[PDB]
Paper text:
In this study, we determined the crystal structures of E. coli (S)-ureidoglycolate dehydrogenase AllD, which forms oxalurate in the presence of NAD+. This structure represents a metabolic branch point enzyme during (S)-ureidoglycolate utilization, which is the end product of purine catabolism common to plants, as well as some bacteria and fungi. (S)-Ureidoglycolate dehydrogenase AllD belongs to one of eight clades of l-sulfolactate dehydrogenase-like superfamily. The dimeric structure observed in the asymmetric unit represents the functional unit of AllD, consistent with size-exclusion chromatography, in which AllD eluted as a dimer.
Numbering used by the authors:
A (entry chain B): 4 to 315
B (entry chain A): 1 to 338
The structure:
């Protein structure tokens, strides 16, 4: 069960170094990923996290400092704490701030990997607000037209509340595919589609063992989106940016120094929250009623495929 | 033909003024249009004036809007635009966003009930010129199938971003959420070429190479563009209590009726997070480093995002802006439309 795995991972990470409360938080986010089929960011990471913690490449005793910079802005100085802990804490502050003052823009400064980041925007939506989040990731992607890596798979996530317990959740890597698909096609020795990745010369490739770098989604569009995310979650916070961003296997003894940015918007500072939620539910219904194209059994609203996998 | 920036501005300004816009409003509309043309975004340039003139004439764009700025919090506002010209409403709202982020760090400003606002990167460039990060997005005419779908719901719903580098350097990025903007289907309609099958679908949701058989556009990157246009509809439409999704008006529904569109600006003042000087240095460093990346076979250069358009804008300052001669002919003429 869910509370089973939480207890497992909570225990394992608590003994590898983390305060019990920190272990409980990382556990939760990891399960969340596997359940929604986001396996690249689920348990395939758990022994690894345990290692980095034991070796100090993730801070077991971070000195957190939430620095408020304005009525609707803050930086959580996270001291290279586990990303799941840091990002969750900053989102709690963003939610509190948007609750009172309407909007919140909160940077997470110096954290480890934070995982399937839709977890954090769901926090905002469960509180009745719109959540947007994005973060830097290991340099892994060619600029459009390029043969050298610069940005990472730099994800973007969004959630908004509908009626009752309904939430619409959207989450995407800015590459054609997440990296975890390249490794999957490496392990099963499959070939990969030629739209996913390039070789050491920047030429598209079908051999996942000849992959030097991922391609950006929609060419120049994914390129701009990952740039935007690097500027918003990295440059804005004065952190390393672009190619300077650390990679997971550079040094298990050193903090990652990653950044993440949350933006939270309280609907009642703009219009009726009741009608907002009614209209989100209406969006979800209407999209579901759309005539599917040949080949599709249904049209899903964004994220519904994951919402479904979750409950099964 | 190529033409100056000041002259095109004047032509557009006069033509919209005689349609019935206040000269102040017609000026603002004109500079956003010339901005688009200079950057090569011609589908949102002077080509739209004749349409605008008709809508203004027939009352579908408010020539006497009662603007009302409703401040809802320290960093939030709605500009009620009373179906004023979008370029006017969006710029006014961005001026408020800039002022708000200057004093309070961040601003989220809705433009509620406006006409078409054009190449929306104009508005984020305002923020970047003021030293801030600008993000903007707006609803558009239903024209796009959901991923997996065969009926239209969302529009080409654009997203734009700009941030300042050192000096007058700005990094500007601006995209429709479809594989291609609608103008590419219109352009290949004008010259009778088959389009690739990744752009659009027929009435049945089957991808098509026949531009006259196109019923709807496809979202960029499948479900990703789908999610992005939904996000933009939610942020610039649902959030403002406006018509959303398939309810959004289309350009030729009713020329006598206000469009009721929505747009959302988000402005972030880097000074509220870290040194704005080092921020600008790092944006300029980003642009340099991306330019120095080894190009892949086929390419002669790696561009930083938006650099292709910056180059066009730079060239247009030298040689002048290229527009279709037919548009020049209409702008000098005494005809408002037809
Ligand atoms: N350093 C980090 O933390 C990173 C984390 N990630 C995460 O990994 C995950 C990667 O996601 P991707 O492979 O790009 O996702 P994807 O391509 O499978 O799907 C993207 C989005 O579209 C939705 N979607 C997909 N198919 C759909 C359909 N048929 N109908 C309606 N909606 C549909 C998904 O639910 C999801 O919200 C994300 O959770 C992302 O946050 C990714 C990169 C880096
Ligand atoms: N209702 C409205 O007002 C709407 C307005 N629009 C506008 O129409 C325009 C749509 O543009 P798209 O067709 O998506 O543009 P696009 O596909 O040509 O390019 C998108 C972005 O990527 C950049 N880019 C493209 N190729 C590049 C390269 N090789 N290197 C570096 N950067 C590159 C562009 O400069 C641009 O910033 C936008 O200005 C948008 O604001 C679009 C839809 C609706």
């Amino acid at each position: 069960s869910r509370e089973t795995l939480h207890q497992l991972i909570e225990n394992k990470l608590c003994q590898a170094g983390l305060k019990r409360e920190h272990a409980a938080t990382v556990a939760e986010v990891l399960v969340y990923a596997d359940a929604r089929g986001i396996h690249s960011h689920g348990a395939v990471r758990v022994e690894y996290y345990a290692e980095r913690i034991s070796k100090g490449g993730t801070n077991r005793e971070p000195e957190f400092r939430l620095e408020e910079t304005g009525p609707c802005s803050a930086i959580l100085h996270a001291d290279n704490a586990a990303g799941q802990v840091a990002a969750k804490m900053g989102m709690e502050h963003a939610i509190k701030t948007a609750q009172q003052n309407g909007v919140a823009v909160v940077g997470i400064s110096r954290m480890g990997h934070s995982g399937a980041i839709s977890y954090f925007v769901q926090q905002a939506a469960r509180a009745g607000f719109i959540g947007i989040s994005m973060c830097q990731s290991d340099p892994m992607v060619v600029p459009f037209g390029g043969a050298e890596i610069y940005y990472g798979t730099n994800p973007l996530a969004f959630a908004a509340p509908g009626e009752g317990d309904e939430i619409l959740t959207f989450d995407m890597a800015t590459t054609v595919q997440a990296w975890g698909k390249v490794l999957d096609a490496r392990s099963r020795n499959m070939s990969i589609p030629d739209t996913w990745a390039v070789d050491k010369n920047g030429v598209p490739t079908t051999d996942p063992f000849a992959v030097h770098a991922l391609l950006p989604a929609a060419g120049p569009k994914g390129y701009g989106l990952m740039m935007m995310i690097d500027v918003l979650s990295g440059v804005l916070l004065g952190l390393p940016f672009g190619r300077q961003v650390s990679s997971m296997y550079d040094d298990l003894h050193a903090g990652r120094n990653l950044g993440q940015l949350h933006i939270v918007i309280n609907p009642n500072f703009f219009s009726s929250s009741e009608l907002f939620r009614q209209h989100l539910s209406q969006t979800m219904r209407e999209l579901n009623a759309i005539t599917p194209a040949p080949g599709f059994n249904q049209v899903y609203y964004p994220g519904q495929d994951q919402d479904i996998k979750q409950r099964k």
